[PDB]
Amino acid sequence: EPCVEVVPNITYQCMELNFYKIPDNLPFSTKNLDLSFNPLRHLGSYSFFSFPELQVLDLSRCEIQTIEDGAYQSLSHLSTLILTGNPIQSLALGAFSGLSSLQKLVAVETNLASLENFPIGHLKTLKELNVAHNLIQSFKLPEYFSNLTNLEHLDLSSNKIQSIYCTDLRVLHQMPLLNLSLDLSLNPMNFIQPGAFKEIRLHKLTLRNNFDSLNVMKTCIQGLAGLEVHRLVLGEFRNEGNLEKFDKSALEGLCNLTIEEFRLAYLDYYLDDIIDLFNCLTNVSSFSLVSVTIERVKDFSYNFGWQHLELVNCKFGQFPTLKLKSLKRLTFTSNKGGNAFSEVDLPSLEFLDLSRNGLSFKGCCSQSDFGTTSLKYLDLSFNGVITMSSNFLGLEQLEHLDFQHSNLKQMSEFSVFLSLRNLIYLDISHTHTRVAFNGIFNGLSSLEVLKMAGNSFQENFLPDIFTELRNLTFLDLSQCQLEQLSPTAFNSLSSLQVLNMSHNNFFSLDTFPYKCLNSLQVLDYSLNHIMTSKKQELQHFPSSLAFLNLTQNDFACTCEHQSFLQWIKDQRQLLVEVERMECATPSDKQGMPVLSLNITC
Amino acid sequence: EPCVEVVPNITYQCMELNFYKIPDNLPFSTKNLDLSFNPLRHLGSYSFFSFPELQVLDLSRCEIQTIEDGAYQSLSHLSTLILTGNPIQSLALGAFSGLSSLQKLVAVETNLASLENFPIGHLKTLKELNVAHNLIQSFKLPEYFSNLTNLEHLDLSSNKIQSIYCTDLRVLHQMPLLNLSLDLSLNPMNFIQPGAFKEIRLHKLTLRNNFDSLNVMKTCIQGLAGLEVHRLVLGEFRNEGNLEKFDKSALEGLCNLTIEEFRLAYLDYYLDDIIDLFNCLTNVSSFSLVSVTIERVKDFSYNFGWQHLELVNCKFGQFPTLKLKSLKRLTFTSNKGGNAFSEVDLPSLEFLDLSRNGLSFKGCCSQSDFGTTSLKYLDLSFNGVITMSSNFLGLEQLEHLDFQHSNLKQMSEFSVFLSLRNLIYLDISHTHTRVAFNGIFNGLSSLEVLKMAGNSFQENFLPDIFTELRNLTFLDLSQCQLEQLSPTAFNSLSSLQVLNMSHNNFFSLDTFPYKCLNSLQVLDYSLNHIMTSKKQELQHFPSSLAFLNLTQNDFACTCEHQSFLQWIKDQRQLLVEVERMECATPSDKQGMPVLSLNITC
Amino acid sequence: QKQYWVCNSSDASISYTYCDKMQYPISINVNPCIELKGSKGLLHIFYIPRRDLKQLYFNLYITVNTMNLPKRKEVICRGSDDDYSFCRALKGETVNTTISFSFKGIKFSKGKYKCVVEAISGSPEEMLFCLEFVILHQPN
Amino acid sequence: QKQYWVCNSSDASISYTYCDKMQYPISINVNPCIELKGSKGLLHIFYIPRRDLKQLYFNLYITVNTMNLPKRKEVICRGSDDDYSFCRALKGETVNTTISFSFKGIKFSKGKYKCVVEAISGSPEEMLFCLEFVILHQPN
Ligand SMILES: CCCCCCCCCCCC(=O)O[C@H](CCCCCCCCCCC)CC(=O)N[C@H]1[C@@H](Oc2oc(CO)c(OC(=O)C[C@@H](CCCCCCCCCCC)OC(=O)CCCCCCCCCCC)c(=O)c2OC)O[C@H](CO)[C@@H](OP(=O)(O)O)[C@@H]1O
Ligand SMILES: CCCCCCCCCCCC(=O)O[C@H](CCCCCCCCCCC)CC(=O)N[C@H]1[C@@H](Oc2oc(CO)c(OC(=O)C[C@@H](CCCCCCCCCCC)OC(=O)CCCCCCCCCCC)c(=O)c2OC)O[C@H](CO)[C@@H](OP(=O)(O)O)[C@@H]1O
Ligand SMILES: *[C@@H]1O[C@H](CO)[C@@H](O[C@@H]2O[C@H](CO)[C@@H](O[C@@H]3O[C@H](CO)[C@@H](O)[C@H](O)[C@@H]3O)[C@H](O)[C@H]2NC(C)=O)[C@H](O)[C@H]1NC(C)=O
Ligand SMILES: *[C@@H]1O[C@H](CO)[C@@H](O[C@@H]2O[C@H](CO)[C@@H](O[C@@H]3O[C@H](CO)[C@@H](O)[C@H](O)[C@@H]3O)[C@H](O)[C@H]2NC(C)=O)[C@H](O)[C@H]1NC(C)=O
Ligand SMILES: *[C@@H]1O[C@H](CO)[C@@H](O[C@@H]2O[C@H](CO)[C@@H](O[C@@H]3O[C@H](CO)[C@@H](O)[C@H](O)[C@@H]3O)[C@H](O)[C@H]2NC(C)=O)[C@H](O)[C@H]1NC(C)=O
Ligand SMILES: *[C@@H]1O[C@H](CO)[C@@H](O[C@@H]2O[C@H](CO)[C@@H](O[C@@H]3O[C@H](CO)[C@@H](O)[C@H](O)[C@@H]3O)[C@H](O)[C@H]2NC(C)=O)[C@H](O)[C@H]1NC(C)=O
Ligand SMILES: *[C@@H]1O[C@H](CO)[C@@H](O[C@@H]2O[C@H](CO)[C@@H](O)[C@H](O)[C@H]2NC(C)=O)[C@H](O)[C@H]1NC(C)=O
Ligand SMILES: *[C@@H]1O[C@H](CO)[C@@H](O[C@@H]2O[C@H](CO)[C@@H](O)[C@H](O)[C@H]2NC(C)=O)[C@H](O)[C@H]1NC(C)=O
Ligand SMILES: *[C@@H]1O[C@H](CO)[C@@H](O)[C@H](O)[C@H]1NC(C)=O
Ligand SMILES: *[C@@H]1O[C@H](CO)[C@@H](O)[C@H](O)[C@H]1NC(C)=O
Ligand SMILES: *[C@@H]1O[C@H](CO)[C@@H](O)[C@H](O)[C@H]1NC(C)=O
Ligand SMILES: *[C@@H]1O[C@H](CO)[C@@H](O)[C@H](O)[C@H]1NC(C)=O
Ligand SMILES: *[C@@H]1O[C@H](CO)[C@@H](O)[C@H](O)[C@H]1NC(C)=O
Ligand SMILES: *[C@@H]1O[C@H](CO)[C@@H](O)[C@H](O)[C@H]1NC(C)=O
């Protein structure tokens, strides 16, 4: 079978196989046939009959000239067509004749000329229709749209469209119920007569890099009057030519509409003031900026009503100062410019995310740095340097907290987590810290998840700090250069199930510290160098244990302490990969699995 | 002997022993006798005869009332007197009668009243004279100073002096050669008539916290005219009351003098502009500031002629911008305020020191960040975060460099030290790095000292990076969590003498990697866990070796590999502390020194 | 294999070949020819993909005259509302673009620097293509 | 040993005794009495040293109800041109000063906090004195 079977009897793909006609030896009840880069200079009536059931088809770059009538006749349940790249010089009328249930249709790079010479009038339940990169001239919607229903997208971008007229969209007035996420980008256009968009209701609209100068943009915005969109997107694309100047004079009057979301993307100019700009873009229940470089602005503070804000991949000189009276979520990620921090006042806020920026702190954490009183989530990972000088005072309702891959300071000088009495999640990983104060985890009486991997210990001996954590279940401490454990550390932790203790430097193994843990299932000793036990007092493990790594470490195969190997081969019902436990200390016994070999003496 | 002998037959001290007269049972040829807190209500003629030779004396708080004539008569070579705290109501004239060679004299808290009733007229070669915390009224130098010569200090501070007059210092006009480091601080004074200091030449002058308001300071500075001092010090003390206001109006006219150094200390006001302040303090060949808080100043840049600058324990908002045409040394240490960095332009500079500040970098190192062309020294230790994005280009003459306890980034992505072909010193210690690129030390063809302790390695295996370093002698790599070494790493390093390899995690010992190193003397294996060798192929070490730590690690005492203990006890002429090598692996053999025990089997 | 030459400068001799078995053609050009000292110019690319070049990215395996380096990972365009225009295309659709580039600030010694490129894309994240570059360097 | 009381507040009962054998007297006072919640006030000290209190500094051994802490090292005045006036005195010379202090921003739980003070000074760097503090704390 030249056509590759990737999944048997349902999906069969074969591309670039130099065919000249439809392959038939494929199974009868096949679905989602792929067919690409196979020259089919012309398609014939009933070209697809041996596949009565069929979900997906594809004809991508299969050079097609003319599709005649009757095609796809003996064919139902076909939900997808992809007619990409095939230069069609004559689409025969009546094509797509029998298609009971079609939803998606894609015709890209097909040399079309208009929309009314497109024979989908009998269709229904068609949801998406992508027709882009063509040669179209007028944005005059044909009439069969009245018949059409449940259409959602109509993406006609990067064409040779020039202007609009009120006569257009005279249809679609008679649609009491309609959702249309219209779109048109990269179009060279310069004029819209007023009144065109009127009493219409969309659900999105994207216009990026379709204007050549500022006055054109002003006129075009004047062209929109009463659109009432739910989401609008403006900007440009880096790859091509863009605008030269941008001020408060531009973008003005945009508040003759009724908007509820905004999204500007990739300005190439060094904007310098955000106040009296974006001015009547208030009451917009969301706001966002992407890849804009406002490198010098002074008064970021103002009174907008914004319930959601995003600043992604921007640039800055200062950390922005904010004063919003109703802002429930903030997201300030992946920024590059400044490395500092300042006070903000967000009296009603319930979500933070300051990740990957690389900024620094001082006197990190207190209710006076965010002005709030009820903050439920908080993340500070991948920043530069944080200094602790106040245990979290005034934040008695906080349930999520992360600090991984930051650089902490002064973490072991006092009880840093002392007021948070309702906490569930906590992660301090790969921060260059040094635990040297028993009772640093004092006050956390509800923690259940605890992560710390890569944090040294004083003289490499585990102290007795795990007390009052009576709900902990998932405890993570690995890559911490331990060398020994306290005899009674894991006491009263009667709810642990996972316990990661891999990649450390141990030499002995003992069962006494884990004597009374009635809920363990997983136990991890992977990347250590364990040679023996303190002696053969190795007790039973708690019955509940059913999983135990003991692999990936060098053993010593001499008849000394052979009783240890006797004890380990005594219980094989808990190991994992018996083939990767092998000793290499004696030169002769090398690479030989442990449980296999039998020893003298 | 109640009087404690601290060093035999030369120095004997005894304080607080409740004596009532000079102890005599002390040896005859004793020096530097101490005597403190022993009540001697009155001193008698020839009180000190049994000590004909004597260098130092002391009578501190030994309550003295009257010293009569003839004292210290049978006494020469006595170079020091300390008459502290003893309230003297009558110093008998003719005292200090026979003192051939006296240099230092201290009389503090002695209730003096003037300076001419002080009988040192016959003295000579007296260098220092400290007389402070007394009750003096007039700064009228007596006349025997004409007889006096080689006097250097005269420290009369914290007295009840009120003003000065031109009649004062009429003496000391007739001194063609003279060095006097005069001083007077904490004096409540409010007026100096003009012309007092005229045609005089000092070598220091300190006036800290001796004025009560700004206008008083202006008048007093007007009082100085033509002083020609080599070093001047102003400011105040934190412990007491200070000034309320400070601007360019203050401190003006200070350039009627001829100064060459300046030092302001501990302003308590928030100064806000440094230009047009310190204005005619140009041509001053040095400048320094200590504990001043100029938290908001904009244009630090200006054209002064300053050949040396210091900013110690200051505070700042921004990192200062500098443009000096002739500044050969800079020292910017222990500051607190800002954490950033910027470009400077110092066209002729040969020394940097930016230590303990805690600031951060980006695009760290290139000749465009310091504008210079010949920089010989450089130190960047104890800062926050440094990022490497350019190997040192344009700095082909740099001989000293340090980075310890910083936080480096991107150190292993390319040859970071590639243009420095004349380097001797280099230290990268406790920076959280990860060596994973062979040839990171490419281009350094003159290094001799190399330090790196606390820097991990990829998978804990030493690669072959030490090539072309044909002069290295002192190589430091410890606390790096090594677990094994390449077989041929230390080749062509035919000039090493010190080699620190302690505190790692080894298990085997082999002599092959160190086969051909004809210049080793010291070899360090201290805080490891060495149990045995790979086998008994342990060769001879290079003859030159004469020092070898093998202590502080746990051994295993079983007759298995007893040949290893035979081999180690075979050469004891290179060990260090044979008493701290003892095994603890077998429970019986614990704490017992190794070379002592003898084993069966 | 066949040798695909690109351009020559005073100190650069860029060239490239295929790495894996798939041999879908491609056309690349740079102007002006790079000098390994910090340059600036334009890069013209013409290609016809075979998978959805969406959330594309790059893996890079470098080699400095037989000394390897860590693996570099470059995210070209991600998620929604991307900076580049071309990375919303589909299969069979021709991509034809030009992008500007510039660098300066590092000294490279003589050698035979070699690079390995891996393009990954698609919602199931398969490879797209792979090439092998060769760059000589002889400072004057 | 003898019990040296200092002052009482709503939540503080500071007291102190000697640690080592030397028992050179000293006089300390604070106003107003510290509240272990962040306060501000003045501290009056009268003393008569026995060594040159020059380049003085402090070592601190803390104890939080039987849990030790690391050792703290405080440099009071150092080198030349120091901030404080008193630290240029000599033996036998009376020191009599007052200094202002203030703190706020940390919550301390109930307990029996205890501290160990070590003053080091002099050019040969000998100890000067040593004391033991006791601070109860019962928030209202
Ligand atoms: C196909 C070859 C395999 C890849 C070759 C190496 C690629 C390394 C990937 C990372 C490079 C990068 O980060 O981008 C940019 C240089 C672009 C690379 C050149 C395109 C290659 C063309 C290949 C086809 C042609 C045949 C560097 C950069 O930092 N960009 C951000 C920055 O730009 C801004 O400031 C920087 C600061 O340096 C300078 O940079 C410089 O001039 C020097 C810069 C790069 C030095 C290495 C350049 C390698 C050239 C390879 C030649 C190709 C021969 C085949 O310094 C560095 O950044 C060092 C970083 C570590 C480099 C390690 C590479 C060593 C490999 C050696 C292999 C021989 C810029 O000029 C510019 O200043 C004007 O800052 C801006 C923002 O201001 C930022 O934009 P953004 O904030 O929106 O993201 C840029 O992204
Ligand atoms: C004798 C008892 C043993 C010692 C007790 C602990 C001493 C700890 C030494 C370090 C303290 C310190 O750094 O100074 C200062 C507080 C002074 C200590 C109080 C004097 C004790 C009197 C003893 C005799 C009386 C019986 C803190 C400080 O940071 N100072 C610099 C700073 O001041 C400035 O900004 C800070 C920012 O916090 C605030 O601080 C605060 O209010 C809180 C501060 C200290 C919290 C601990 C205070 C312990 C009091 C002990 C009570 C005594 C009972 C016997 O927060 C912190 O700094 C936390 C640092 C870690 C603290 C660990 C101690 C835990 C031990 C618990 C033992 C029970 C200041 O109010 C103030 O804001 C106005 O910044 C300025 C500059 O702006 C700086 O000046 P500088 O730049 O010129 O150096 C200050 O030095
Ligand atoms: C305890 O924590 C460690 C963290 O170090 C967990 O470890 C990780 O285990 C996975 C599974 O083997 C490793 O993934 C592997 O990567 C290789 C190379 O790509 C691949 O071939 C394997 O198939 C596998 O995917 C992973 O590298 C390793 N380390 C990390 C940092 O993730 C471990 O699972 C934890 N134990 C328990 C019981 O949770
Ligand atoms: C012995 O160690 C190995 C690793 O060294 C354990 O492997 C298992 O590791 C994988 C990889 O992380 C875990 O994977 C799953 O990973 C996805 C990654 O996105 C995560 O989202 C899932 O929640 C899930 O954790 C896998 O869970 C983990 N095994 C177990 C049982 O959790 C291996 O498990 C260790 N041996 C034993 C008996 O656990
Ligand atoms: C190799 O590098 C290590 C650095 O870890 C050098 O080590 C240090 O050795 C000295 C001398 O024993 C240690 O000082 C000791 O401190 C204790 C406690 O105060 C004191 O009782 C001893 O008398 C001694 O002074 C020091 O702690 C130790 N570590 C460090 C970080 O300095 C070692 O000397 C180097 N080897 C060679 C041959 O240079
Ligand atoms: C075995 O290890 C010990 C340390 O664990 C080596 O001790 C010696 O350590 C001292 C302390 O650092 C070195 O001290 C001198 O220290 C001053 C400190 O300021 C330094 O400025 C001097 O330049 C000097 O290094 C001492 O030099 C060092 N011993 C030697 C021979 O250098 C001990 O030396 C190790 N065993 C052998 C045989 O080296
Ligand atoms: C571009 O540069 C390369 C490298 O210098 C040239 O290739 C070499 O070409 C010279 C001259 O023809 C030969 O002598 C060498 O044997 C070639 N070596 C290799 C490894 O190819 C190349 O010729 C240059 N291109 C042009 C058009 O001159
Ligand atoms: C200062 O506070 C302390 C601590 O509360 C007081 O000491 C206690 O005093 C009460 C009342 O006299 C006694 O009942 C306790 O037995 C004491 N306990 C200890 C440990 O001393 C002290 O009395 C207070 N000072 C004054 C003047 O009231
Ligand atoms: C289209 O609009 C309707 C209006 O109610 C909404 O329910 C639906 O979710 C929208 N379509 C999509 C894909 O969200
Ligand atoms: C968690 O802890 C709280 C208080 O410590 C306790 O009331 C509760 O029973 C524990 N378990 C769960 C599942 O909440
Ligand atoms: C005093 O001044 C002279 C002037 O030549 C100088 O040589 C000498 O060093 C000075 N004294 C001190 C202690 O520096
Ligand atoms: C140091 O290295 C240089 C060049 O590598 C060499 O000329 C010199 O002999 C070496 N030794 C000394 C002591 O300079
Ligand atoms: C790519 O587009 C440019 C636009 O003018 C065109 O000149 C060029 O021929 C196109 N590429 C190809 C391979 O045709
Ligand atoms: C310390 O000086 C003040 C200054 O007025 C004085 O009142 C006090 O009595 C002095 N201390 C002693 C113990 O005399």
UniProtKB/TrEMBL annotation, chains C, D:
SUPFAM superfamilies named in the record: E set domains
UniProt GO cellular component terms: extracellular region; lipopolysaccharide receptor complex; plasma membrane
Location in the cell: Secreted, Extracellular space
Gene3D superfamilies: 2.60.40.770
UniProt KW Disulfide bond keyword: yes
One Gene Ontology term from the biological process aspect of the record: positive regulation of tumor necrosis factor production
Keywords in alphabetical order: Disulfide bond, Glycoprotein, Immunity, Inflammatory response, Innate immunity, Secreted, Signal
Primary localization: secreted
Gene Ontology molecular-function annotations: lipopolysaccharide binding; lipopolysaccharide immune receptor activity; Toll-like receptor 4 binding
Domain MD-2-related lipid-recognition: 16-135
Pfam families reported in the protein's UniProt record: E1_DerP2_DerF2
Function: Binds bacterial lipopolysaccharide (LPS). Cooperates with TLR4 in the innate immune response to bacterial lipopolysaccharide (LPS), and with TLR2 in the response to cell wall components from Gram-positive and Gram-negative bacteria. Enhances TLR4-dependent activation of NF-kappa-B. Cells expressing both LY96 and TLR4, but not TLR4 alone, respond to LPS.
Name of the protein: Lymphocyte antigen 96
Organism: Pan troglodytes (Chimpanzee)
Gene coding for it: LY96
